[PDB]
Amino acid sequence: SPTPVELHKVTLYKDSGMEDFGFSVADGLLEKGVYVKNIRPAGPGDLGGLKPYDRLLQVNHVRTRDFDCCLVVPLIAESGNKLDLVISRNP
């Protein structure tokens, strides 16, 4: 809990013209990967359940755990009208 993240399935919905799904991510340079840096309060991300630090593990079945921001950013906006992914955050 104090650190050991916890996997949590999340799903969202994008809009024809949005630049993101409702939350920006950051490249985890402390090891490898990317985690949500900020989510729109009361938005798709908040409605889905994305909690700060939610390190996107698998995006739409694609294991983007060892991916980078440049790969997670597009993968997020490339999911289409919906973003189904499995993230990990410390409770």
UniProtKB/Swiss-Prot annotation:
It comes from the Eukaryota. Transmembrane segments: none annotated. It is found in: Cytoplasmic vesicle; Perikaryon; Cell projection, Dendrite; Cytoplasm. Residues 9-91 form the PDZ domain. Expressed in brain, testis and retina. In brain highly expressed in the olfactory bulb, cortex and hippocampus and lower level in thalamus, cerebellum and spinal cord. In brain it is found in the perikaryon, dendrites, dendritic shafts, dendritic spines and, excitatory and inhibitory synapses of neurons. In retina, it is most abundant in the plexiform layers than in perikarya. Interacts with EFNB1, EPHA7, EPHB2, EFNB3, KIF5A, KIF5C, KIF5B and the C-terminal tail of PRLHR. Forms a ternary complex with GRIA2 and CSPG4. Can form homomultimers or heteromultimers with GRIP2. Interacts with GRIA2, GRIA3, GRIPAP1/GRASP1, PPFIA1, PPFIA4, FRAS1, PLCD4, PTPRF and liprins-alpha. Interacts with ATAD1 in an ATP-dependent manner. ATAD1-catalyzed ATP hydrolysis disrupts binding to ATAD1 and to GRIA2 and leads to AMPAR complex disassembly. Interacts with SLC30A9. Interacts with BUD23. May play a role as a localized scaffold for the assembly of a multiprotein signaling complex and as mediator of the trafficking of its binding partners at specific subcellular location in neurons. Through complex formation with NSG1, GRIA2 and STX12 controls the intracellular fate of AMPAR and the endosomal sorting of the GRIA2 subunit toward recycling and membrane targeting. PDZ 6 mediates interaction with the PDZ recognition motif of EFNB1 and EPHB2 and with the C-terminus of PPFIA1 and PPFIA4. PDZ 4 and PDZ 5 mediate interaction with PRLHR. PDZ 4 and PDZ 5 mediate interaction with the C-terminus of GRIA2 and GRIA3. PDZ 4, PDZ 5 and PDZ 6 mediate homomultimers. PDZ 7 mediates interaction with PDZ domain of GRASP1. PDZ 7 domain binds CSPG4. PDZ 6 mediates interaction with the C-terminus of liprins-alpha. PDZ 1, PDZ 2 and PDZ 3 mediate interaction with the PDZ-binding motif of FRAS1. This is Glutamate receptor-interacting protein 1.
